[PDB]
């Protein structure tokens, strides 16, 4: 293969990392923003209050997005297995 093919392949990989990390962390970041807005409004300065909401939401987002995330990784592995013949030559 040529350099541009492998760069295209790494763009695919970094795009997977990006959309998975987004899917899992966007809910946690949103609830962090919400509870931090609460802290700022009520003038509460308790800098580890945000942990349990963010953790519950990360676990629930791993439960909700877990199936299609594993399907997306499985499809990526398969698509790099069919991509092997053009490596072969």
């Amino acid at each position: 293969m040529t350099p541009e093919i492998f760069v295209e392949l790494f763009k695919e990989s970094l795009w997977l990392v990006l959309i998975m990390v987004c899917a899992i962390i966007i809910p946690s970041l949103l609830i962090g923003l919400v509870v931090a807005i609460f802290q700022a409004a009520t003038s509460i300065n308790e800098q580890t209050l945000s942990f349990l909401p963010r953790l519950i939401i990360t676990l629930l987002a791993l439960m909700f997005f877990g199936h299609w995330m594993t399907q997306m990784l499985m499809d990526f592995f398969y698509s790099m297995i069919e991509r092997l013949p053009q490596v072969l030559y």
């Binding site: 990392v17 942990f51 990360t58 791993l62 499985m74 092997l84 072969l88």
Partner: protein, 191 residues
Amino acid sequence: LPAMVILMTSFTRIVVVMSILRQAMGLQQTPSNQVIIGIALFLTFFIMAPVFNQINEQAVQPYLNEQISARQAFDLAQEPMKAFMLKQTRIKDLETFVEMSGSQVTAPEQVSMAVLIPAFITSELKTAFQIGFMLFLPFLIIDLVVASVLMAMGMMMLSPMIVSLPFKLMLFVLVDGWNLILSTLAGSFAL
């Protein structure tokens, strides 16, 4: 020196791909170099079965029923071994190695065995690395996803190499892994 025969075969591509694999998915010193060498040496027996049939039933058995010059066998064994080698080497690597040996441009399948062996091992190293670093890649997503899900919520210290290992095993099982890696490595050789 008698193990060089095995490096002439398709042993140097499987060992490298599997050594990339065990390092790709978490495992340190899981299946050890000895186990990987064993499994790859069995996969060569599986893949090189037509070549070993060609050599045995055409240069070894007539040597057992000698009726022939003893060294002549090494002439009839070199032919079907080379035919496997030459369909696997890139043409560019073979041409550069012929220039490097200094001889003039000759047609392929006439190049000497001594010029074909290094042109084969380097072309198998290129292939093994380009296959392994592609299979490496789905196991590098999980490493980067996990280590980004942790470092987002923090924890700073939970090693992403022990929390992502179950996920790597899970993915490698769901894909079935070995039925696609050890199977596409046997259909990786066209002859």
